[PDB]
Amino acid sequence: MFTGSIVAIVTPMDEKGNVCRASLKKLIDYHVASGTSAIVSVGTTGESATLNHDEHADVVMMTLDLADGRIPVIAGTGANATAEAISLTQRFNDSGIVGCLTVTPYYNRPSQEGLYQHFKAIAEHTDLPQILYNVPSRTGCDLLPETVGRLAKVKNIIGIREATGNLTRVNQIKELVSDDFVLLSGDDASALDFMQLGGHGVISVTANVAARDMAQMCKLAAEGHFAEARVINQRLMPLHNKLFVEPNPIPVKWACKELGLVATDTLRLPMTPITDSGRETVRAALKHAGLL
Amino acid sequence: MFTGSIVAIVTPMDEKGNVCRASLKKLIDYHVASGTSAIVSVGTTGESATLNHDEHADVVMMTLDLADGRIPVIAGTGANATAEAISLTQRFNDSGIVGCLTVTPYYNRPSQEGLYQHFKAIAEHTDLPQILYNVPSRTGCDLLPETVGRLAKVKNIIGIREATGNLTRVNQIKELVSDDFVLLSGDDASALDFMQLGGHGVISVTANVAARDMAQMCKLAAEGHFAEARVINQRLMPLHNKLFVEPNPIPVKWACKELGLVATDTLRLPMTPITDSGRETVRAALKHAGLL
Ligand SMILES: [K+]
Numbered sequence A, B: 001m002f003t004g005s006i007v008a009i010v011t012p013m014d015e016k017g018n019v020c021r022a023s024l025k026k027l028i029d030y031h032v033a034s035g036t037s038a039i040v041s042v043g044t045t046g047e048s049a050t051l052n053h054d055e056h057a058d059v060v061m062m063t064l065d066l067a068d069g070r071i072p073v074i075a076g077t078g079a080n081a082t083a084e085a086i087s088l089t090q091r092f093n094d095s096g097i098v099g100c101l102t103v104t105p106y107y108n109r110p111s112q113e114g115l116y117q118h119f120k121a122i123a124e125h126t127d128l129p130q131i132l133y134n135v136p137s138r139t140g141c142d143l144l145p146e147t148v149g150r151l152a153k154v155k156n157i158i159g160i161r162e163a164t165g166n167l168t169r170v171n172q173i174k175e176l177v178s179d180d181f182v183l184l185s186g187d188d189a190s191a192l193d194f195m196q197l198g199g200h201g202v203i204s205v206t207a208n209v210a211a212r213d214m215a216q217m218c219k220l221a222a223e224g225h226f227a228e229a230r231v232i233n234q235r236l237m238p239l240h241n242k243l244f245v246e247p248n249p250i251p252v253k254w255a256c257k258e259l260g261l262v263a264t265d266t267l268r269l270p271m272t273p274i275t276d277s278g279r280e281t282v283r284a285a286l287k288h289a290g291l292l
């Protein structure tokens, strides 16, 4: 539910940029059948940036509806204003989601004390489990281990998705927090290393198109079978890298279309269509993963 | 003017975090009296991050009404979704603002082609002059000179504000753009250097509390009296640095309160009150500048 392979699922769109219910349904059936532990609905990969809060809620509600209890859903709920973050959380109260993935404020670059108050205030006004999300390359702000240790003492802050790719953070955080605080990778290419060092899972972009391998790899990692997991990781590694050859979620939406998982690879501005060179590189990485 | 000393004005708030009309009015009178060339309303320093679009529009129109034709007002109109950027801009069509300051999409990290499509689309849905704003440390995105060269050929994209502090960019950009394309520094500490290199002015955080000196320094620069402009700059240098000792606009808001320009130093979460140590740092820089 908060461990293993968690997908950061795309928000499939028609050619007009509106959510495509039929494509979303295919994806959810795909994850239920493939053994994905949970779905993150409307995070970065789900184009949270270019959906308004109303569309955002509709997509999360649609996802719960289609999931029909077969797989846990986590809603993305971050905002760079504490009052908006709180307010967005309230829309999901008593909805069926099992928790929230909430990002560090982007753009306004708060202090560590500001991060602590941001996340503490969010956790206060919900009964829902909160997972902190740290991705400094996008936000301009880095949530430090010391601060995670402070926040972990809050009852319903249950874990962190760490996307720096800085693997020393695993044990710096682990020393400061209780044994049931969940550490998740937010970086596909370093996620197996992350789990090998003590991590419990990954919120994965690769899982959109290689769900079964990711789930097996995460299960082997959790059992301590790292060599066996590493074999699968090597065949996924080109995907781990090339899904980011052009801005995420551009390559992965195109890959979902190439596999037939979604009807179109349409995105919203300022995301733009994949280049021909991009297609060639992604295609080669899909073939290396044995998916084409 | 899109030249000289432009203030990135704080949005003064009451203890509730709502805009304080009397403080705003005072700040605007102060800039009219001090020779400030124009006001940027609700940019970063004016806490665009924690105002919703309606509050944002209210502050811009309030600012414009209080300016009462005495000084040009530039609206901050940045958004990381192109549709939302278009919609915020449209609020100010036929308003009386003289132009828009529009930041590169933050968080979602579009490609250079994405930035080109984003800004081109914004420019197409307005008659207002557009100044591009580059601040990679906040956005996760870097608008490169070449892309600025492309954008400079859209009729109503008329300048760039450059906050990297990478002084090389002045002449890389100048070489690819028209001689009437406006180049503004977005980094107080390097702004005189930026102007000595061929830059046309500064969108300043320092100008909030030292408007007279900043106005004078940019005038001397424009006349080529750099030795003299530098005397003022050395006086202001501790401010150019220490106004960022804690996250902007925490220290500048505190400085405004201390100088008696605003009633309250309140900000919206995740910005937090200046620390005791921060006050003392800021007080000292204000003394060095001769304002305290
Ligand atoms: K949004």
Ligand SMILES: [K+]
Pocket: A053, A084, A087
């Ligand atoms: K809202």
Ligand SMILES: [K+]
Pocket: A121, A124
């Ligand atoms: K509270």
Ligand SMILES: [K+]
Pocket: A151, A152, A153, A154, A155, A156, A157, A158
């Ligand atoms: K806890």
Ligand SMILES: [K+]
Pocket: A081, B048, B049, B050, B051, B052, B053
């Ligand atoms: K905002």
Ligand SMILES: [K+]
Pocket: B151, B152, B153, B154, B155, B156, B157, B158
């Ligand atoms: K132009």
